[PDB]
Amino acid sequence: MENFQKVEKIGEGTYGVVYKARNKLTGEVVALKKIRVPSTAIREISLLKELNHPNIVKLLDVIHTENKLYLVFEFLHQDLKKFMDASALTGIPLPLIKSYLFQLLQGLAFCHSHRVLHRDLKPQNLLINTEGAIKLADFGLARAFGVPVRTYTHEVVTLWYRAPEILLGCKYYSTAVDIWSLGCIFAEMVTRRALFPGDSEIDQLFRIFRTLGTPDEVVWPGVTSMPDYKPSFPKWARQDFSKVVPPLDEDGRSLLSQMLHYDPNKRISAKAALAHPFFQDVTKPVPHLRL
Ligand SMILES: CC(C)c1nc2c(OCC3CCCCC3)nc(N)nc2[nH]1
């Protein structure tokens, strides 16, 4: 760690503090993360250093010293959460939403092809630069250190982007969980409001049900035998997407519906999503960032 000079506290992640830092040797400006000895974690994280892609925040270095783990990441200057908050008055223009979605799906398709999932996508871990790129941060960290209810600061970990199979207690969930989360973020970029802002697991589930309909054996074979499924769940009818994400056009609503399929086996893959007609006219606009 002596090789790094902390510039500033960026914030507090799930596992530890995140610092903006300078490498005293390379001159590099970086995101330095403190993770709150386990050899299985070392080995997992070392596999991540290999998983390199332009829409994945690069893991530069893993440093295990004194019973302590530090991850050194590529640094980006702004996150999607703050960008959305700053664009709240007129919205992010559709061509930019589409470009970001497209790039994030390329990110997922890559990781998923290597059997690596994120599990905790959220606006705060999607990072953007001045050139119009967006990148997924902290990929793979969840299978290394788990997802707690509270962070080390007791901050509440958000449920808003959590897939229904996780909430229903599936232990062996798939890459489809990341597609669900990205669908939720897509809807939020469009409407400028979170799609399912649950404040407990049941509230999260019940918000999902109220918009997409309570799932049953017709739309999701196997659903009623999931660990946390209860026959006593209220039965809500599904809303039309035209009501859920106006003014998203038919191509967008079509794609979003496939990202939000209940059955993870029906839910569109990242690769198939990249071929959806929504992306026919996709471009790469540059955002206006005040840094
Ligand atoms: C200057 C701000 C926008 C910033 N944050 C970064 C970051 O992660 C910090 C967050 C990760 C997700 C959870 C909250 C902290 N990770 C990386 N690599 N760069 C960042 N740049």
Side-chain angles (χ1 to χ4, degrees), residues 1-35 37-291:
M1 274 317 91
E2 52 261 13
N3 299 272
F4 299 94
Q5 162 182 101
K6 296 178 254 207
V7 176
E8 68 183 348
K9 182 158 140 152
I10 290 180
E12 294 159 332
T14 292
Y15 315 114
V17 69
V18 180
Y19 289 111
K20 181 177 182 179
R22 176 166 325 253
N23 195 310
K24 291 169 181 154
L25 230 129
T26 55
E28 285 178 318
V29 155
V30 306
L32 181 68
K33 303 178 197 217
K34 271 217 231 252
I35 300 296
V37 31
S39 313
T40 194
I42 301 302
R43 285 179 212 115
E44 271 285 8
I45 299 310
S46 299
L47 275 153
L48 295 180
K49 309 197 270 174
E50 287 197 311
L51 177 97
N52 300 135
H53 176 101
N55 301 112
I56 299 303
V57 182
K58 191 180 163 59
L59 179 55
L60 309 174
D61 281 289
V62 178
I63 299 158
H64 196 215
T65 40
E66 30 215 60
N67 202 50
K68 279 194 158 151
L69 186 48
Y70 303 85
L71 316 180
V72 189
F73 284 95
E74 163 189 18
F75 176 87
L76 280 92
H77 282 81
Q78 157 87 306
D79 73 20
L80 186 66
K81 170 69 169 197
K82 281 160 173 126
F83 187 65
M84 277 196 291
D85 285 349
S87 307
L89 258 57
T90 179
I92 301 171
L94 184 64
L96 191 49
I97 294 184
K98 189 178 298 199
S99 166
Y100 281 170
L101 182 57
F102 190 68
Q103 289 179 63
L104 299 165
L105 286 164
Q106 293 175 240
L108 296 186
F110 173 80
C111 294
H112 291 173
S113 71
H114 293 89
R115 315 139 221 123
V116 175
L117 13 166
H118 187 118
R119 217 236 94 141
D120 197 25
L121 294 189
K122 68 189 80 161
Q124 293 83 356
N125 59 214
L126 304 182
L127 302 179
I128 61 168
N129 64 21
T130 42
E131 331 271 355
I134 180 149
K135 306 195 189 202
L136 285 113
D138 297 354
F139 227 104
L141 296 204
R143 162 156 196 202
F145 319 119
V147 167
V149 166
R150 317 287 202 107
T151 74
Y152 77 112
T153 26
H154 318 98
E155 155 156 63
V156 171
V157 181
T158 187
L159 303 171
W160 297 1
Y161 311 97
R162 188 167 295 176
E165 65 272 29
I166 302 180
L167 295 159
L168 291 173
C170 164
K171 284 286 103 150
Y172 301 93
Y173 41 74
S174 69
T175 57
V177 301
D178 291 331
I179 292 297
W180 177 272
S181 299
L182 193 46
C184 289
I185 296 167
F186 176 24
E188 187 170 346
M189 290 198 277
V190 165
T191 63
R192 314 180 227 153
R193 200 151 131 158
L195 179 59
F196 305 127
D199 65 351
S200 66
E201 289 187 47
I202 204 61
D203 184 64
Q204 189 66 42
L205 198 61
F206 284 1
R207 284 171 177 273
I208 297 172
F209 294 179
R210 280 197 286 273
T211 295
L212 304 175
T214 300
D216 54 15
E217 289 289 328
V218 183
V219 65
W220 192 355
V223 73
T224 64
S225 67
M226 305 201 71
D228 304 309
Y229 171 90
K230 310 268 152 38
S232 52
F233 283 164
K235 280 159 185 147
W236 287 285
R238 182 177 181 91
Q239 293 176 20
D240 286 329
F241 273 44
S242 63
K243 178 172 169 68
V244 185
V245 295
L248 198 54
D249 66 59
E250 194 65 55
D251 284 321
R253 297 188 317 247
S254 173
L255 164 64
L256 180 68
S257 81
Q258 287 179 87
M259 298 180 82
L260 302 175
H261 278 318
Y262 270 121
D263 189 336
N265 302 93
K266 289 198 138 326
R267 193 168 313 147
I268 196 163
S269 67
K271 298 250 196 228
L274 289 168
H276 196 284
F278 188 59
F279 295 114
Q280 201 232 64
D281 66 359
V282 74
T283 58
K284 190 186 186 158
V286 316
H288 186 226
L289 296 180
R290 311 210 225 202
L291 304 172

